[PDB]
Design an enzyme around this catalytic site. Structure first.
Site, PDB file in Angstrom:
ATOM      1  CB  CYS A  29      -0.658  -0.007   1.370  1.00  0.00           C
ATOM      2  SG  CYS A  29      -1.732   1.599   1.603  1.00  0.00           S
ATOM      3  CB  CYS A  32      -0.988   1.837   4.564  1.00  0.00           C
ATOM      4  SG  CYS A  32      -2.297   1.415   3.317  1.00  0.00           S
TER       5      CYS A  32
END
Length: 105
Positions: A29, A32
């Site tokens: 990600c 994140c």
């Protein structure tokens, strides 16, 4: 240490009856990483109250299909097999701490 949930223990964990904030994240990600260190400091903040658990939705794909986790990161608090509050995107530890104070009490 944060908790680490996983497909099988995930649903058997939340569905019992236990305050657990499930963190849905991934190592691939992008944003994140923003809240990455606030989440580990979040387990330092409440600690004896918040079970900050960690599901890799890459590895464990059963609950991401049930809720439809369309954009990691995604924080969901479950108290008795029912998500009381879903909040997503980047949220500071200050946003988190007040958010979770309501549901943990």
């Amino acid at each position: 240490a944060t908790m680490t949930l996983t497909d099988a223990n995930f649903q058997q964990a939340i569905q019992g009856d236990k305050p657990v904030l499930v963190d849905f994240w991934a190592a691939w990600c992008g944003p994140c990483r923003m809240m990455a260190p606030v989440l580990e400091e979040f387990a330092e903040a409440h600690a004896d109250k918040v079970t900050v658990a960690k599901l890799n939705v890459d590895e464990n794909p059963e609950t991401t299909s049930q809720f439809g986790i369309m954009s990691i990161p995604t924080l969901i608090l479950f108290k008795g097999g029912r998500p009381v509050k879903q909040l997503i995107g980047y949220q500071p530890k200050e946003q988190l701490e007040a958010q979770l104070a309501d549901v943990l009490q």
